[PDB]
């Protein structure tokens, strides 16, 4: 299996700090995306760690996940500043037209939804950003152009 | 020693510095409720139901509050009672209320605290916990009644060092789980049963098989033999309102006779069988001087812990079967031909206090010698089911010819009592004489220490012996052995802390000092017997001279031996 | 690079690179913060740097280093962090011309280099114009937003490259450390406690007592640790401080480690912010090659080391108790106290945990003394507090004010009033950690004690302004939903009571509510405040309780009358028909599945609210638009 070669040299370079577990579980998602259902108890039995403790770590933090991620991830902000300018209805328009709920992805083409709050463009309307093409002032009717160029 | 002066509820208190404000108020004739606290665990503070009010006017938890000079506290103020009532309403708002179906009925602590705090109308009605029940083997997990106290995780973390289960998810939807919701058989569990003993709700229980026993009894052509464990005789009476440690052998024999069982036997006969076989093995290993140290096989959980974690010690383990399986083989091999019954038509039931026996009964390699197993709680529930009054029964003895026993096989429910039952036999077989007077008892292997060590001198020959109770102490002693500091000869390991008297099948108790009472009961039972030596039993010798003619023979190697295979799957 | 020797060599290199800045004539700089790098900031940079490479300009080099230390540059491109006024961007500034240019979308990028650089003229059509006044502002200090701010903590930001160590050193920093090694530690602690400095974020405890208590603990190896992580989704200060100038944070770390006697330290920053953690890695590596970090610092013998630990999300991680667990590599579950974190924290060693606003004022306090720092603000609690203004105001963004001034000029004079000429309703301070303040208590000075008697705490410092447009029940339910999703779930009160309160608020805002729910909300709020374990559960019901305490009229309107005064709750909408504007098309009857509107054609219709499903399709489907949501 080719999977058991990319996870080997990462437990030797960024694993010399005494007590590091969070960093290793983050670079795996960074370099592959999907946190595998099989690698977890392998990295557990490897160094010193029971599988139960790192399973508990993996499901607590919202950044980690155990379900397929699409190529393109869309975030709807939803901080307390970008909530007063009608940012509740834009996610409703998203789920009305595309189909998937928040936190559930359509694995077919490329799409995934996520709810990270209050990005650094705070002060420029509710900021619904695509992976690298953050927008500004948005309207429930503007959604269509997001489906136009990104499709 | 430095004492601290304070007042609690208007009463002066003298207590040593360092005790909490809950554990130092128990000796005033007052007790404050709590669910997240146990006497064997570090305080955790997840219940938030043991709160009290100090002088300032803010509610402070008690199970993790050290006491200092100059506080006034009150545990009956209306604000504290209102807070406790609201907290229990919040708990019971999300609990599936099938108290008829709950196995922990009439013993659940949540039920008793809901009765005590006078809850009558739940105002907070909303979304409940709706999970799905899965099967795991001898452990029945229902994550609909969990209150997330964390006792099971801490007892599998702080004491056992097994790390089998851990928390998962967050918020209202958090629960206790193995990795990826795999069954407990394939996880790192070793089936010790400690998590079952400490659960204050009905989340963790036993997969109960009274039904199969009932169609076994109802079949007119099936003959039923039931065997009883040594550690059951000292703990059953607690189920009927007696003081723990009362000898109830005759009463439970009468109850088993009236329950419809065809024959009743004790497993002390097979225990003496194991003692004499293990003594022969130890003498053989001393004469060759190979494969040291050698480990006992009396605990299935220890065998699982070796097969899962330490597969390199497999050649160093004794190949003798557990006494339960040896009694099953004897009943289905020798007794059946004596009575004149077919092997398929004999039903063997066991009453043992352990939980790993439930898993061990269904191994494919044992050829299904025993068909079903029980624990003490199910035996008590059957006794109360048939209507038998336990107080006013009459004492009656065991059956024949596997009923009588010796004093060497009555101390298996104590940490150290197995090797203490084998040193007398080794002394007899190697020296040629028998111990007399107080030299029968070995005082160096009694107590409750984590690791017990002794250097026993027999006819000028010294042997080094060790006892480890609890898997944590076993891991420590295995580390010491692999360090090569000192060499041993014969090592006993019991998975549960304190021996088989603290197994998962024993009845629930709230007294903090039950272990001392159970040890005293076991020792009083041992000292109240005429014969104290395993070698002096008669029917053991009769069985050898009629069917085997020699211990450690080819027939004994065929029937009283098994082999172990590694379970550590490569990743 | 060359290694730094003792203090006199540091001053020599100080002078040598002070020469570097005065060997230049013209400089241009761009806001490099996250505010500009969302609508095009590097795009403006490349729209202009290629012009400089085709207009006969040779000295173009941006990153100043040792190889280019002796290059007299006629033009110099700078990269600076959050200069301020991030409401209107991207921000451009050139020196020594003295202009303040906003709205620099790349449509006239060629005019700025032809006019201001060559002809030394100022373009007026793109300058900032106040819609209320119409005046044109050319100087930064002349701007009303910068008029009354005290640029004290943020002295070096907006004019110092975060990616160049030689830029911060050449401003006048890193002298407090040099003065500190040449003097004792007890007088450092005495100056700290005498200055009146106390914790900026969260609690507000005096830092002098914590530092002295850490000093009094005789331990071999103790820790110094940084909690810079703005978990609350209200403001942005963790973004500004590190991405502006991280070297002052490292200098504060060095001062603290020399004072208490620490030899290794940690910084906890969220990994979701890539630019900030990247800048910290660059600063740490450049300082490590620079020689101020390590063993035998400047020939004294004091040893120090810094690690940057990347977090993994959750808001309940910096409680000062779950953070040590998270760094250790376990779940972020808070543990009980006592023992506190000052006696046995990270790996059972003593720790000191200060927000990174307290580790920023330390070099200023060391340089100027406690007499100067205590001279600002009320003597009960000194210093200045930074704020992030957001909501329905004309000017949003970062602000730093002398603490003790009235809120009215903070919200109206600095903020430029309320946008769209609407009416102001309420202010929320601290995000989820604070309550509401209405218009009636706008004349209260901002400080610890008077705000404590008002029931609201400043917390992190995020200030959000909400107008009459919204309904307060929805705002409280939004806070409750955030708290419900963002808990940890260890103790019964928080875990159960937050869900119950969220369900009760959702029932009320849906129109299914009943009488007596307010008493249940108050009882639950009291119990959850009293019986929680950490600060999150102790502080969670504060927005709901404050909204009930100040806006009972909204709750009574939602419960009994079944009408929302602001018309922001869609579950209590009321559609009405204009009789004159209706022509009896009947499309509302056709498109509504239940058809609660019934009437004759070419006649006005009547709506029965009893059988109406309130889907809103009636107004949007009939093209006449006579149906209005009132
Ligand atoms: C729910 C919750 C949120 C917190 N959020 C922050 C935060 O955003 N920033 C921060 O510096 N500290 C936060 N803290 C608390 C930290 O422990 C804090 O760094 C510490 O109290 C500061 O002490 P000091 O003021 O003496 O420096 C939070 C605590 C809780 C319980
Ligand atoms: S756990 Fe207790 S309260 Fe819950 S159903 Fe069982 S007996 Fe009733
Ligand atoms: S049976 Fe023992 S090892 Fe298994 S989960 Fe329970 S306590 Fe842990
Ligand atoms: S399973 Fe039982 S012991 Fe474990 S957390 Fe749930 S209630 Fe507590
Ligand atoms: S010590 Fe006894 S009760 Fe405990 S697991 Fe072993 S055999 Fe079972
Ligand atoms: S109060 Fe809430 S956030 Fe705090 S420890 Fe308890 S459950 Fe977790
Ligand atoms: S939408 Fe206007 S014109 Fe059409 S039925 Fe309604 S009120 Fe009449
Ligand atoms: S939403 Fe209500 S008012 Fe509008 S058409 Fe439907 S029933 Fe009539
Ligand atoms: S709260 Fe939405 S970007 Fe700041
Ligand atoms: S159960 Fe005692 S403090 Fe929580
Ligand atoms: S620094 Fe970029 S918007 Fe202000
Ligand atoms: Zn409303």
């Amino acid at each position: 299996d080719p999977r058991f070669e990319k996870v080997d040299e990462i437990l030797s370079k960024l694993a010399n700090e005494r007590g590091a577990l969070i960093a290793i579980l983050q670079h795996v998602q960074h370099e592959f995306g999907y946190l595998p259902e099989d690698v977890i108890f392998y990295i557990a039995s490897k160094t010193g760690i029971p599988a139960s403790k790192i399973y508990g770590v993996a499901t607590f933090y919202a950044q980690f996940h155990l379900k397929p991620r699409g190529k393109y991830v869309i975030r709807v902000c939803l901080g307390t500043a970008c909530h007063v300018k009608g940012a509740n209805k834009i996610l409703a328009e998203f789920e009305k037209q595309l189909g998937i709920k928040a936190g559930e992805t359509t694995s077919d083409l490329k799409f995934t939804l996520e709810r990270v709050g209050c990005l650094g463009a705070c002060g420029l309307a509710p900021t619904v950003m695509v992976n690298e093409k953050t927008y500004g002032k948005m309207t429930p009717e503007k959604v269509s152009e997001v489906l136009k160029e990104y499709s | 020693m430095n004492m601290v002066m304070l007042t609690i509820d208007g009463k002066q208190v003298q207590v040593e510095k360092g005790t909490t404000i809950k554990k130092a108020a128990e000796k005033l004739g007052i007790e404050i409720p709590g669910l997240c606290d146990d006497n064997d665990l570090k305080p955790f503070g997840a219940c938030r139901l043991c709160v009290v009010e100090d002088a300032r006017g803010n509610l402070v938890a008690s199970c993790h509050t050290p006491v200092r000079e100059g506080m006034v506290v009150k545990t009956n103020s209306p604000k504290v009672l209102k807070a406790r009532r609201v907290i229990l309403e919040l708990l019971l708002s999300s609990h599936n209320a099938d108290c008829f179906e709950c196995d922990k009925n009439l013993h659940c602590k949540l039920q008793k605290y809901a009765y005590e705090l006078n809850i009558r109308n739940i105002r907070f009605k909303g979304e409940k916990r709706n999970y799905e029940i899965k099967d795991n083997g001898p452990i029945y997990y229902d994550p609909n009644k969990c209150i997330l106290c964390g006792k099971c995780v801490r007892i599998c973390e702080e004491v056992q060092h097994i790390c089998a289960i851990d928390f998962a998810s967050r918020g209202f939807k958090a629960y206790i789980s193995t990795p990826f919701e795999k069954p407990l058989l394939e996880s790192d569990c070793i089936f010790c049963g400690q998590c079952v003993r400490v659960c204050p709700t009905g989340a963790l229980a036993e997969k109960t098989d009274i039904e199969r026993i009932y169609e076994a009894i109802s079949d007119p052509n099936k003959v039923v033999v039931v065997q009883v464990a040594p550690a059951v005789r000292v703990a059953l009476g607690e189920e009927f309102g007696l003081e723990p440690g009362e000898i109830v052998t005759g009463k439970m024999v009468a109850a088993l006779k009236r329950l419809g069982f065809d024959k009743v036997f004790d497993t002390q006969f097979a225990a003496d069988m194991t003692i004499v076989e293990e003594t022969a093995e130890l003498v053989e290993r001393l004469e060759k001087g190979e494969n040291f140290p050698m480990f006992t096989s009396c605990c299935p959980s220890w065998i699982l812990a070796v097969e899962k974690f330490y597969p390199e010690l497999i050649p160093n383990i004794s190949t003798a079967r557990s006494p339960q399986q040896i009694f099953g083989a004897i009943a289905k091999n020798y007794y059946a031909k004596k009575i004149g019954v077919a092997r398929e038509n004999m039903f063997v039931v066991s009453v043992m206090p352990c939980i790993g026996k439930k898993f061990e009964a269904t191994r494919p390699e044992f050829n299904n010698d025993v068909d079903a197993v029980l624990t003490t709680r199910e035996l008590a529930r059957m006794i109360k089911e048939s209507g038998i009054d336990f107080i006013k029964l009459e004492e009656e003895n065991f059956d024949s010819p596997l009923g009588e026993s010796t004093g060497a096989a009555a101390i298996f429910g104590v940490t150290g009592g197995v090797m203490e039952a084998a040193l007398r036999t080794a002394y007899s077989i190697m020296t040629g004489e028998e111990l007399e007077g107080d030299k029968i008892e070995f005082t160096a292997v009694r107590g409750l220490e984590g690791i017990k060590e002794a250097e026993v001198d027999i006819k000028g020959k010294k042997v080094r012996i060790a006892i480890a109770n609890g898997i944590g102490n076993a891991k420590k002693l295995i580390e010491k052995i692999k360090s090569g500091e000192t060499k041993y000869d014969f090592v006993e390991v019991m998975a549960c802390p304190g021996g088989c008297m603290s197994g998962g099948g024993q009845p629930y108790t709230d007294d903090p000092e039950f272990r001392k009472k159970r040890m005293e009961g076991i020792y009083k039972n041992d000292r109240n017997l005429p014969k104290r030596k395993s070698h002096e039993n008669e029917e053991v010798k009769k069985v050898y001279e009629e069917y085997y003619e020699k211990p450690c023979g080819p027939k004994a190697h065929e029937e009283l031996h098994t082999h172990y295979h590694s379970r550590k799957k490569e990743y | 690079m060359v290694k730094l020797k003792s203090i006199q060599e540091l001053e020599n290199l100080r002078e040598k690179i002070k020469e570097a800045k005065k060997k230049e004539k013209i400089v241009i700089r761009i806001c490099g913060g996250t505010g500009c790098r969302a609508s095009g900031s590097l795009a403006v940079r490349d729209e202009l740097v290629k012009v400089l490479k085709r207009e006969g300009f040779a000295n173009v080099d941006v990153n100043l280093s040792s190889d280019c230390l002796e290059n007299t540059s006629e033009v110099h491109v700078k990269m600076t962090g959050c200069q301020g006024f991030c409401a209107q961007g991207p921000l451009m500034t050139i020196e020594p011309l003295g202009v303040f240019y906003v709205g620099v979308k790349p449509e006239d990028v060629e005019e700025i280099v032809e006019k201001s650089i060559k002809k030394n003229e100022i373009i007026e059509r793109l300058l900032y114009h106040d819609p209320a006044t119409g005046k044109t502002y050319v100087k930064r200090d002349e701007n009303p937003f910068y008029a009354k701010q005290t640029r004290l903590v943020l002295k070096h930001c907006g004019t110092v490259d975060p990616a160049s160590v030689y830029d911060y050193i050449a401003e006048g920093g890193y002298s407090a450390i040099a003065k500190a090694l040449t003097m004792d530690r007890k007088q450092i602690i005495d100056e700290v406690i005498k200055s009146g400095l106390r914790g900026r974020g969260g609690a507000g405890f005096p830092t002098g007592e914590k530092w002295l208590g850490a000093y009094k603990n005789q331990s071999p190896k103790k820790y110094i640790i940084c909690n810079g992580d703005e978990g609350d989704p209200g403001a942005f200060m963790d973004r500004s401080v590190m991405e502006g100038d991280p070297h002052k944070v490292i200098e504060g770390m060095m001062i603290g480690a020399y004072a208490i006697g620490s030899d290794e330290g940690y910084i906890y920053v969220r990994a979701e912010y890539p630019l900030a953690v990247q800048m910290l890695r660059k600063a740490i590596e450049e300082c490590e090659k620079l020689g101020l970090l390590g063993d035998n610092i400047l020939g004294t013998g004091f040893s120090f080391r810094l690690h940057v630990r990347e977090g993994a999300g959750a808001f309940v991680c910096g409680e000062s108790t779950a953070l040590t667990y998270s760094i250790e590599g376990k779940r972020g579950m808070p543990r009980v106290r006592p023992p506190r974190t000052n006696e046995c924290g990270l790996w059972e060693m003593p720790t000191v945990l200060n927000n990174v606003e307290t580790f920023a004022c330390i070099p200023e306090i060391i340089l100027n003394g406690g007499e100067w720092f205590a001279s600002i603000g009320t003597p009960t609690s000194t210093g200045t507090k930074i704020f992030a203004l957001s909501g329905k105001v004309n000017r949003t963004g970062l602000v730093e004010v002398p603490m003790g001034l009235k809120l009215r000029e903070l919200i109206f004079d600095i903020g430029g009033g309320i946008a769209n000429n609407k009416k102001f309703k309420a202010v929320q301070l601290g995000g989820p950690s604070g309550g509401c303040v209405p218009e009636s208590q706008l004349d209260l000075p901002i400080d610890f004690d008077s705000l404590s008697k008002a029931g609201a705490i400043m917390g992190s410092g995020g200030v959000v302004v909400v107008d009459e447009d919204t309904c307060m029940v929805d705002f409280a339910k939004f806070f409750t939903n955030f708290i419900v999703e963002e808990s940890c779930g260890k103790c019964i009160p928080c875990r159960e009571g937050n869900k119950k309160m969220l369900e009760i608020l959702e029932r009320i805002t849906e129109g299914k509510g009943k009488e007596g729910d307010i008493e249940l909300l108050e009882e639950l709020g009291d119990v959850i405040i009293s019986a929680s374990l950490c600060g999150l559960g102790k502080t969670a019901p504060n927005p709901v309780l404050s909204t009930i305490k100040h806006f009972r009229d909204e709750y009574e309107a939602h419960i009994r009358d079944k009408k929302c005064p602001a018309g922001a709750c869609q579950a209590l909408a009321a559609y009405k028909i204009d009789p004159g504007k209706c022509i009896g098309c009947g499309k509302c009857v056709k498109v509504c599945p239940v058809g609660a509107i019934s009437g004759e054609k070419k006649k006005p219709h009547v709506i029965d609210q009893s059988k109406c499903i309130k889907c809103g399709a009636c107004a949007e489907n009939c093209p006449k638009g006579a149906i209005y949501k009132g």
Side-chain angles (χ1 to χ4, degrees), chain B residues 117-124:
Chain B
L117 275 74
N118 189 359
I119 289 172
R120 226 178 283 106
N121 218 338
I122 294 309
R123 282 197 299 294
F124 310 138

mmCIF file with all atom_site columns, all heavy atoms in Angstrom, chain B residues 117-124:
data_model
loop_
_atom_site.group_PDB
_atom_site.id
_atom_site.type_symbol
_atom_site.label_atom_id
_atom_site.label_alt_id
_atom_site.label_comp_id
_atom_site.label_asym_id
_atom_site.label_entity_id
_atom_site.label_seq_id
_atom_site.pdbx_PDB_ins_code
_atom_site.Cartn_x
_atom_site.Cartn_y
_atom_site.Cartn_z
_atom_site.occupancy
_atom_site.B_iso_or_equiv
_atom_site.pdbx_formal_charge
_atom_site.auth_seq_id
_atom_site.auth_comp_id
_atom_site.auth_asym_id
_atom_site.auth_atom_id
_atom_site.pdbx_PDB_model_num
ATOM 1  N N   . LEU B 1 117 ? -34.277 13.911 46.396 1.00 0.00 ? 117 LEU B N   1
ATOM 2  C CA  . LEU B 1 117 ? -34.364 15.355 46.222 1.00 0.00 ? 117 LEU B CA  1
ATOM 3  C C   . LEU B 1 117 ? -35.757 15.832 45.836 1.00 0.00 ? 117 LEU B C   1
ATOM 4  O O   . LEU B 1 117 ? -35.918 17.011 45.507 1.00 0.00 ? 117 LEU B O   1
ATOM 5  C CB  . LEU B 1 117 ? -33.345 15.831 45.184 1.00 0.00 ? 117 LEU B CB  1
ATOM 6  C CG  . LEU B 1 117 ? -31.932 16.112 45.701 1.00 0.00 ? 117 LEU B CG  1
ATOM 7  C CD1 . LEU B 1 117 ? -31.161 14.840 46.006 1.00 0.00 ? 117 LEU B CD1 1
ATOM 8  C CD2 . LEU B 1 117 ? -31.183 16.965 44.708 1.00 0.00 ? 117 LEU B CD2 1
ATOM 9  N N   . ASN B 1 118 ? -36.754 14.945 45.867 1.00 0.00 ? 118 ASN B N   1
ATOM 10 C CA  . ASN B 1 118 ? -38.170 15.297 45.753 1.00 0.00 ? 118 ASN B CA  1
ATOM 11 C C   . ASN B 1 118 ? -38.459 16.003 44.422 1.00 0.00 ? 118 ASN B C   1
ATOM 12 O O   . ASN B 1 118 ? -38.856 17.168 44.365 1.00 0.00 ? 118 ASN B O   1
ATOM 13 C CB  . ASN B 1 118 ? -38.594 16.153 46.956 1.00 0.00 ? 118 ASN B CB  1
ATOM 14 C CG  . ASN B 1 118 ? -40.094 16.384 47.028 1.00 0.00 ? 118 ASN B CG  1
ATOM 15 O OD1 . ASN B 1 118 ? -40.854 15.934 46.171 1.00 0.00 ? 118 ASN B OD1 1
ATOM 16 N ND2 . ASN B 1 118 ? -40.525 17.094 48.063 1.00 0.00 ? 118 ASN B ND2 1
ATOM 17 N N   . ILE B 1 119 ? -38.239 15.257 43.343 1.00 0.00 ? 119 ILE B N   1
ATOM 18 C CA  . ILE B 1 119 ? -38.580 15.696 41.996 1.00 0.00 ? 119 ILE B CA  1
ATOM 19 C C   . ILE B 1 119 ? -39.959 15.153 41.652 1.00 0.00 ? 119 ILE B C   1
ATOM 20 O O   . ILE B 1 119 ? -40.213 13.951 41.790 1.00 0.00 ? 119 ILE B O   1
ATOM 21 C CB  . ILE B 1 119 ? -37.534 15.230 40.971 1.00 0.00 ? 119 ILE B CB  1
ATOM 22 C CG1 . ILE B 1 119 ? -36.234 16.005 41.153 1.00 0.00 ? 119 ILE B CG1 1
ATOM 23 C CG2 . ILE B 1 119 ? -38.052 15.398 39.555 1.00 0.00 ? 119 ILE B CG2 1
ATOM 24 C CD1 . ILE B 1 119 ? -35.117 15.478 40.307 1.00 0.00 ? 119 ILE B CD1 1
ATOM 25 N N   . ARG B 1 120 ? -40.852 16.036 41.203 1.00 0.00 ? 120 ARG B N   1
ATOM 26 C CA  . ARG B 1 120 ? -42.234 15.658 40.941 1.00 0.00 ? 120 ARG B CA  1
ATOM 27 C C   . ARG B 1 120 ? -42.761 16.076 39.579 1.00 0.00 ? 120 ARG B C   1
ATOM 28 O O   . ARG B 1 120 ? -43.698 15.435 39.088 1.00 0.00 ? 120 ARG B O   1
ATOM 29 C CB  . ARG B 1 120 ? -43.159 16.248 42.015 1.00 0.00 ? 120 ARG B CB  1
ATOM 30 C CG  . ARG B 1 120 ? -44.174 15.273 42.571 1.00 0.00 ? 120 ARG B CG  1
ATOM 31 C CD  . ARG B 1 120 ? -45.002 15.945 43.642 1.00 0.00 ? 120 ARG B CD  1
ATOM 32 N NE  . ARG B 1 120 ? -44.267 16.053 44.895 1.00 0.00 ? 120 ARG B NE  1
ATOM 33 C CZ  . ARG B 1 120 ? -43.749 17.181 45.361 1.00 0.00 ? 120 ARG B CZ  1
ATOM 34 N NH1 . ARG B 1 120 ? -43.843 18.315 44.687 1.00 0.00 ? 120 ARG B NH1 1
ATOM 35 N NH2 . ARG B 1 120 ? -43.126 17.172 46.535 1.00 0.00 ? 120 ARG B NH2 1
ATOM 36 N N   . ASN B 1 121 ? -42.211 17.112 38.954 1.00 0.00 ? 121 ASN B N   1
ATOM 37 C CA  . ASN B 1 121 ? -42.741 17.593 37.683 1.00 0.00 ? 121 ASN B CA  1
ATOM 38 C C   . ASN B 1 121 ? -41.602 18.185 36.870 1.00 0.00 ? 121 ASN B C   1
ATOM 39 O O   . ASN B 1 121 ? -41.089 19.255 37.208 1.00 0.00 ? 121 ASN B O   1
ATOM 40 C CB  . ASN B 1 121 ? -43.841 18.631 37.907 1.00 0.00 ? 121 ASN B CB  1
ATOM 41 C CG  . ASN B 1 121 ? -44.971 18.504 36.908 1.00 0.00 ? 121 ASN B CG  1
ATOM 42 O OD1 . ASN B 1 121 ? -44.797 17.949 35.824 1.00 0.00 ? 121 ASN B OD1 1
ATOM 43 N ND2 . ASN B 1 121 ? -46.142 19.017 37.271 1.00 0.00 ? 121 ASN B ND2 1
ATOM 44 N N   . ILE B 1 122 ? -41.216 17.492 35.804 1.00 0.00 ? 122 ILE B N   1
ATOM 45 C CA  . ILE B 1 122 ? -40.136 17.954 34.938 1.00 0.00 ? 122 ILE B CA  1
ATOM 46 C C   . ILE B 1 122 ? -40.674 19.061 34.039 1.00 0.00 ? 122 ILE B C   1
ATOM 47 O O   . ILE B 1 122 ? -41.512 18.815 33.167 1.00 0.00 ? 122 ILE B O   1
ATOM 48 C CB  . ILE B 1 122 ? -39.558 16.798 34.111 1.00 0.00 ? 122 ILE B CB  1
ATOM 49 C CG1 . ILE B 1 122 ? -38.865 15.784 35.020 1.00 0.00 ? 122 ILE B CG1 1
ATOM 50 C CG2 . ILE B 1 122 ? -38.577 17.324 33.080 1.00 0.00 ? 122 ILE B CG2 1
ATOM 51 C CD1 . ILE B 1 122 ? -37.874 16.402 35.973 1.00 0.00 ? 122 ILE B CD1 1
ATOM 52 N N   . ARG B 1 123 ? -40.195 20.284 34.257 1.00 0.00 ? 123 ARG B N   1
ATOM 53 C CA  . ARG B 1 123 ? -40.627 21.428 33.465 1.00 0.00 ? 123 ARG B CA  1
ATOM 54 C C   . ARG B 1 123 ? -39.858 21.545 32.156 1.00 0.00 ? 123 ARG B C   1
ATOM 55 O O   . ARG B 1 123 ? -40.381 22.088 31.178 1.00 0.00 ? 123 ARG B O   1
ATOM 56 C CB  . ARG B 1 123 ? -40.466 22.716 34.275 1.00 0.00 ? 123 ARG B CB  1
ATOM 57 C CG  . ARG B 1 123 ? -41.560 22.951 35.296 1.00 0.00 ? 123 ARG B CG  1
ATOM 58 C CD  . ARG B 1 123 ? -41.571 24.406 35.750 1.00 0.00 ? 123 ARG B CD  1
ATOM 59 N NE  . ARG B 1 123 ? -40.321 24.813 36.384 1.00 0.00 ? 123 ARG B NE  1
ATOM 60 C CZ  . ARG B 1 123 ? -39.857 24.348 37.538 1.00 0.00 ? 123 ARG B CZ  1
ATOM 61 N NH1 . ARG B 1 123 ? -40.547 23.488 38.270 1.00 0.00 ? 123 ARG B NH1 1
ATOM 62 N NH2 . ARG B 1 123 ? -38.675 24.771 37.978 1.00 0.00 ? 123 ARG B NH2 1
ATOM 63 N N   . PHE B 1 124 ? -38.624 21.050 32.121 1.00 0.00 ? 124 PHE B N   1
ATOM 64 C CA  . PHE B 1 124 ? -37.766 21.143 30.940 1.00 0.00 ? 124 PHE B CA  1
ATOM 65 C C   . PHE B 1 124 ? -37.952 19.870 30.123 1.00 0.00 ? 124 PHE B C   1
ATOM 66 O O   . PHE B 1 124 ? -37.306 18.852 30.369 1.00 0.00 ? 124 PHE B O   1
ATOM 67 C CB  . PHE B 1 124 ? -36.309 21.340 31.343 1.00 0.00 ? 124 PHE B CB  1
ATOM 68 C CG  . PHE B 1 124 ? -36.096 22.441 32.341 1.00 0.00 ? 124 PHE B CG  1
ATOM 69 C CD1 . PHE B 1 124 ? -35.223 22.269 33.399 1.00 0.00 ? 124 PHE B CD1 1
ATOM 70 C CD2 . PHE B 1 124 ? -36.777 23.640 32.228 1.00 0.00 ? 124 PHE B CD2 1
ATOM 71 C CE1 . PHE B 1 124 ? -35.025 23.275 34.322 1.00 0.00 ? 124 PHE B CE1 1
ATOM 72 C CE2 . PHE B 1 124 ? -36.582 24.652 33.149 1.00 0.00 ? 124 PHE B CE2 1
ATOM 73 C CZ  . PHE B 1 124 ? -35.705 24.468 34.197 1.00 0.00 ? 124 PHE B CZ  1
#
